[PDB]
């Protein structure tokens, strides 16, 4: 009846693949540097222990629970968990979030593929020594020419022809994997991509470790992230930043886990498999990820400038700073190729995970073939992405409502539906059923009180500090993007309507 993962190992590597592309290498280093890396470890571990693990297991169980009844998607899974019309409209969010994220994410993934192509061939800017900004500016210009950034006032992006071609290639590659299916495509690619990612990261970590400059060494930069500033541990903002990173550490709230877990067999383990996968992502995020960006930056610019450059963001550190830092070292363009090849493969395992929920919806509810479901989903993403490519703050706008506010809000709804409405006793049985290991009794208290309290705190905080703080100082072109992604929610709600009408006719 339903597709299933062939092997336990490929399932875990596939699941681990979702979180890797969502800034695993870039986000964690920045959050630690802003909040004191050594000090930041304790909040990060508490959040991973009291938020990430419980929610991951909740998502795994909801996916597998729905997959037994033939549904991999939250409109139907919520309705099975909660027999109410409002659960179906709430489930639309769980389709909407991964779809909106995909609209701009695959485009960003294309940037790594294009940059990797340009670096491999050596078609990169070369700074002439040494001025911190004069090294950074020619690469900042390089990204802007690729994206088509205007002067600054204009809201129009003029993407390069090369960047458009690469976006098509990137989309075609996504389709090649997704069209093969769960085991022939996703699972086969994850068994190839994850080890390749591991070798590049380790290779990069060793290479970065050997970087030295009169401004500093890379070993000094590594020491900045493990020596604690215990005085910064008392700040509530560090705890707010720790919980938020965990969502990107494990790709919680994007719907990828649920849809993936729907192809887990009804009696297969989710307790050990999900715990292993979440451990893989955390180890890769801390060890491998938190050892390439910051240490290389500290070596070239010293500790002080590095924090000022780490405050420029995780994206400014990934496409401008690190390529400019590798630009000066021996074999540096090839190291930039490796860095960008790493990002692309990490993106590939993630872009296929957030496009699979829409593919599952068409198959499960509208009864489309995999071929048609993959192509139609590809068409919708490719078409909608023209908004992200040509409208200036459009990417930023989708990232906020879907990938920032949306995922955290949806994570709380998953908890309440499964553990409060569906029943905490029922949900506990569903989680631990078929488990190689069993969840400890303490997590029943955590999943029912601690985890929802932490999320509601993060939300109300992330709300008041982001949502209504500045609703008036955004340019008027943001309404274009808001109008479109609101139309997408109406489109999905109509499809859920059609799906019920066909299900009321198949009787
Ligand atoms: C395959 C479907 C094509 C849809 C066309 C989208 C609008 C065209 O897009 C433009 O194409 C030009 C070259 O063709 C590029 O130079 C421009 O960068 C790009 O903006
Ligand atoms: C692996 C393939 C990567 C994409 C290669 C296509 C690069 C498109 O690049 C374009 O090619 C044109 C020539 O036809 C030139 O006139 C344009 O200046 C150039 O931007
Ligand atoms: C595509 C047509 C959209 C029309 C835009 C809505 C009317 C303009 O609304 C604008 O919204 C901004 C929100 O940040 C405010 O800062 C501006 O003051 C306001 O003029
Ligand atoms: C913001 C919440 C409102 C978004 C638009 C929902 C209004 C449409 O209502 C929809 O009608 C359908 C009838 O079958 C039902 O399947 C859906 O559950 C219901 O949400």
Residue numbers in the entry: 4 to 131, 134 to 512
Reproduce text from the manuscript describing this model.
The structures pinpoint Leu25 of LeuT—a completely conserved residue in the NSS family—as a key residue for stabilization of the empty substrate and Na+ sites associated with the inward-to-outward conformational transition.
We obtained two crystal forms, which however display a closely related crystal packing that is also recurrent in other LeuT structures: a C2 form with one LeuT molecule in the asymmetric unit determined at 3.1 Å maximum resolution, and a P21 form with two molecules and determined at 2.5 Å resolution. The lower-resolution C2 form structure was obtained at pH 5.0 and overlays well with molecule B in the higher resolution P21 form obtained at pH 6.5, for which the molecule A is slightly more open. Therefore, the P21 form is the main subject for further analysis as it shows both representations of the same functional state and is determined at a higher resolution. At the unwound part between TM1a and TM1b, we observe a key difference to the Na+-bound forms at the substrate-binding site: Leu25, which is conserved in all NSS, has rotated due to a neighbouring flip at the polypeptide chain, and it now directs the side chain into the vacant S1 substrate-binding site. The Asn27 and Thr254 side chains both interact with Na+ at Na1 in Na+-bound forms, but now interact with the buried Glu290 side chain (molecule A). In a slightly more open molecule A conformation Asn27 adopts a similar rotamer as in the Na+-bound states; however, interacting directly with Glu290 side chain. In a more closed molecule B (similar to the C2 form at pH 5), Asn27 is moved away from Glu290 and interacts with the backbone of Ala289 and Asn286 on TM7. However, we observe residual density in molecule A that superimposes with the molecule B rotamer of Asn27 and a water molecule, thus indicating flexibility of the structure in this region as also noted by relatively high B-factors (see above).
